[PDB]
């Protein structure tokens with residue numbers, strides 16, 4: 001309300017949870033902060049591939065949100081938004097209730113666009129998903145069914161995907177788990193299908209020796225790999241794959257039987273956000289300026305996967321660049337600073353900073369990780385790492401992030417860099 | 422003097438130059454800051470290998486100090502200290518003049534311990550040095566003489582060395598330059614001799630895949646490599662090498678003719694500092710606490726290569742861990758903070774922080790670099806990088822560091838990390 005702006009945060013994920021705490025900390029008792037999310041629990045997304053192979057359980061990576069934000073004075077609504085009216089500034093919830101806002105911060109993350117590939121929905125066929133704990137559990141269930149009746153395995157990433165790391169991770173740990181169970185030789189064929197122009201392109205034109213190292217890794221595991229692929233449909237338990245050359249000309253089509261499969265889908269914006277007129281590009285990603293403010297509505301901000309970021313390259317099969325944790329947190333930090341500024345007259349000048357990508361993958365005893373910045377080459381940092389220490393770091397960071405999600409963040413979040421001091 | 426402490430900084434190198442500026446900035450006009458150094462010019466040490474092969478000239482990497490520190494109000498004495506009397510707090514200069522201090526900050530860097538290996542002094546035989554611009558020029562001169570009369574080449578690192586990167590760098594660019602001149606096939610043999618237990622140990626038990634990558638690099642260049650070596654003497658233009666096994670038992674002795682050679686020597690403390698009773702360990706390195714204060718004299722501090730750092734490992738042939746730029750700067754920063762604190766009653770609690778090692782090497786078009794921390798494994802960061810971007814970064818950092826040495830530093834120095842903001 002006037003003189004006491006009501007700030008709503010839509011989505012309680014990697015960006016959204018921290019945003020709720022930071023907003024409340026920045027605004028204080030004189031303003032209402034409301035967090036709205038489809039689920040009543042927080043999940044640590046990077047741990048889902050492990051749930052998909054059964055190395056982790058839901059309880060390890062998820063927890064109920066309500067008590068933790070409420071003791072901070074944040075209102076929490078565990079309800080999905082179905083409609084956003086940016087004119088009236090009203091949000092319509094799944095139960096038909098309406099919530100008004102003075103500022104809205106959109107952190108709704110990706111819609112998994114299974115519809116791009118008929119038959120690819122995890123509920124429609126053998127191609128599963130590990131992006132959410134709900135999907136990863138279903139993936140693991142189908143993995144167990146594979147163990148009972150071995151058959152061909154197909155893991156990879158669809159056309160338009162932007163999150164390639166976890167597909168590589170998942171293929172590796174599936175291969176690893178199979179060995180452990182003494183079941184690897186029961187597998188007729190193990191295939192990796194990707195929209196990448198080459199192995200380890202990762203939607204970022206490669207980083208360090210990602211190409212060489214991921215190529216050798218897949219080969220060590222007896223995983224046959226195909227690049228420049230798009231899947232046209234999944235039908236009768238078969239994946240119909242089309243492979244192109246540099247000029248997008250078809251050089252072959254394949255039909256792959258699939259007993260167990262997992263393809264990372266293309267990401268779009270969620271329907272309630274995409275549905276807002278003039279808010280989003282055709283992909284449903286919120287068009288924002290460098291201050292995280294929507295270009296159309298001055299009182300709508302966005303952070304996380306939900307925002308639009310222009311491509312810097314074009315691949316033979318469409319692919320996108322990933323939006324990862326540190327950049328998301330910088331986005332969140334900027335949005336909160338600039339909203340608070342608005343509330344106090346001044347114009348916030350804070351930006352998300354330099355584009356970057358960071359990813360950690362754990363194979364069990366050893367991890368792989370990379371850091372790339374900025375987006376276009378030659379970069380200022382372009383590094384790929386592998387080893388037991390990367391694994392230890394993943395474990396440490398997960399423990400830290402989850403604890404922080406329960407304790408609240410102020411916060412200039414990433415000061416876990418004081419491991420220098 | 423009383424109420425106006427006189428602070429002296431001994432050594433105008435990587436640690437010393439910044440220390441002079443930071444001291445003056447921290448203390449201001451009420452205190453006298455004096456910089457004393459053997460040479461009247463600053464040199465960018467990491468560029469010396471390039472001077473040693475002739476890819477760079479003295480003028481590119483060195484500049485006269487006086488005008489730059491004096492316009493900051495810093496007194497500059499271009500004279501070597503011969504004696505330090507810590508009781509009377511007097512420094513005796515080469516010309517016999519004496520300089521008194523209330524606080525002394527020692528940044529004298531390494532003494533190149535050629536005496537450990539009879540005949541190894543660059544002025545006594547064919548084994549040259551690239552650690553200083555004076556030595557690197559002499560190295561290049563002998564390189565040109567090699568071109569006139571090709572003969573065997575021997576490059577590497579002595580027993581007790583702690584700075585291995587530049588030996589690898591130098592071997593690589595010598596090989597590279599030879600090719601460019603169409604002279605590589607005129608070389609009878611090209612040998613790399615190191616005290617490391619294995620290739621790419623680098624005195625830090627390896628970092629990332631340094632072992633694999635440096636091994637392959639030397640092999641690509643037709644450079645035959647030997648580890649676990651110590652050189653017992655250089656005589657009649659031959660290098661007498663002893664190789665041991667894991668238990669330090671001799672497994673062979675070699676006699677290597679040398680037309681052109683360069684071995685990184687072991688580092689000790691400079692004589693004037695080592696000469697101070699109770700100041701140093703037997704190596705001549707200043708024993709300091711975590712606040713950079715000498716354990717014996719409360720008004721003597723030290724930073725840079727000059728300080729003693731305990732070994733965390735023991736190799737078959739003695740070797741040491743390197744002391745590199747970022748850690749040196751943290752040392753400097755801490756010493757300055759704690760001296761200023763002393764001057765104002767309080768006890769400074771600032772420390773150098775976590776042990777780390779960082780090194781950049783440029784091969785011409787592409788560079789290699791690493792970061793390791795902390796000292797002992799498993800590390801929190803253990804990364805090796807290679808590529809054109811590393812080269813671009815070396816070029817950039819050198820340009821930046823030199824400009825800063827002319828303009829002065831305040832300063833929380835390394836904020837060239839805002840390439841994130």
Ligand SMILES: Cc1cc2nc3c(=O)[nH]c(=O)nc-3n(C[C@H](O)[C@H](O)[C@H](O)COP(=O)(O)OP(=O)(O)OC[C@H]3O[C@@H](n4cnc5c(N)ncnc54)[C@H](O)[C@@H]3O)c2cc1C
Pocket residue numbers: 010011012013014015016036037038039045046047048049079080081082107108109110130131132163166270272273303304305306323324325326328358359360361
């Ligand atoms: C398998 C996988 C592995 C990954 N690994 C890494 C890694 O190692 N390192 C790294 O930096 N990044 C990693 N990421 C990338 C990234 O950081 C995550 O995807 C991250 O969770 C995205 O943050 P977000 O806040 O934008 O979206 P999300 O975390 O998905 O949060 C979005 C939230 O808003 C909600 N929501 C959606 N629609 C509505 C609605 N209509 N109404 C109400 N709520 C709604 C959601 O249910 C959810 O809680 C990974 C991503 C995936 C899928």
Ligand SMILES: Cc1cc2nc3c(=O)[nH]c(=O)nc-3n(C[C@H](O)[C@H](O)[C@H](O)COP(=O)(O)OP(=O)(O)OC[C@H]3O[C@@H](n4cnc5c(N)ncnc54)[C@H](O)[C@@H]3O)c2cc1C
Pocket residue numbers: 431432433434435436437457458459460466467468469470500501502503528529530531551552553584587691693694724725726727744745746747749779780781782
């Ligand atoms: C070949 C080589 C390559 C290197 N490359 C890297 C790299 O890529 N990255 C990195 O972080 N580090 C690198 N280093 C390591 C390191 O950072 C440097 O050695 C650095 O110059 C050390 O800083 P310092 O202030 O301790 O000693 P120095 O830089 O040697 O400065 C010491 C100074 O004090 C003086 N002095 C000595 N005795 C006296 C005396 N009795 N009286 C008066 N003055 C005296 C000197 O003449 C000199 O000016 C390299 C070192 C070498 C030798």
Ligand SMILES: CCCCCCCCCCCCO[C@@H]1O[C@H](CO)[C@@H](O[C@H]2O[C@H](CO)[C@@H](O)[C@H](O)[C@H]2O)[C@H](O)[C@H]1O
Pocket residue numbers: 165166168169172213214216217218359360361368369370385386387629630633
């Ligand atoms: C971050 C997301 C991106 C992808 C995530 C999942 C990808 C899977 C990674 C496959 C790598 C497997 O293969 C593994 O790679 C590295 C090669 O650098 C090798 O390891 C090599 O370099 C490392 C350091 O980085 C050294 O410690 C090691 O001694 C050396 O052999 C291993 O011998 C090999 O077994």
Ligand SMILES: CCCCCCCCCCCCO[C@@H]1O[C@H](CO)[C@@H](O[C@H]2O[C@H](CO)[C@@H](O)[C@H](O)[C@H]2O)[C@H](O)[C@H]1O
Pocket residue numbers: 208209212586587589590593634635637638639780781782789790791806807808
């Ligand atoms: C920092 C100080 C330590 C040592 C300094 C001097 C050491 C010399 C380095 C020798 C390396 C030469 O060999 C070179 O190594 C890397 C291997 O990772 C290869 O490069 C490989 O990884 C890089 C990324 O890191 C990719 O961009 C490249 O496409 C891939 O082939 C090169 O194909 C090879 O030519």
Ligand SMILES: CCCCCCCCCCC1=C(C)C(=O)C(OC)=C(OC)C1=O
Pocket residue numbers: 014045046324325326327329356358359360371394397398401
């Ligand atoms: C240039 C800055 C790089 C920061 C990286 C160092 C430590 C943090 C790891 C990155 C990371 C972040 C930020 C992160 O937010 C996140 O959760 C989604 C991860 O998944 C485990 C991450 O691996």
Ligand SMILES: CCCCCCCCCCC1=C(C)C(=O)C(OC)=C(OC)C1=O
Pocket residue numbers: 435466467745746747748750777779780781792815818819822
């Ligand atoms: C954990 C912190 C790592 C910092 C490294 C990023 C940028 C700086 C490069 C390191 C470096 C420093 C600090 C440095 O002081 C120095 O001069 C002696 C170099 O030689 C060229 C260096 O390469």
Ligand SMILES: [S]
Pocket residue numbers: 128129130131132263264265
């Ligand atoms: S997925």
Ligand SMILES: [S]
Pocket residue numbers: 162163164165322323
């Ligand atoms: S991703």
Ligand SMILES: [S]
Pocket residue numbers: 162163164165166202322359
């Ligand atoms: S990724």
Ligand SMILES: [S]
Pocket residue numbers: 163164165166358359360
């Ligand atoms: S990722």
Ligand SMILES: [S]
Pocket residue numbers: 549550551552553684685686
């Ligand atoms: S040297």
Ligand SMILES: [S]
Pocket residue numbers: 583584585586743744
């Ligand atoms: S060094």
Ligand SMILES: [S]
Pocket residue numbers: 583584585586587623743780
């Ligand atoms: S080094």
Ligand SMILES: [S]
Pocket residue numbers: 584585586587779780781
């Ligand atoms: S170095």
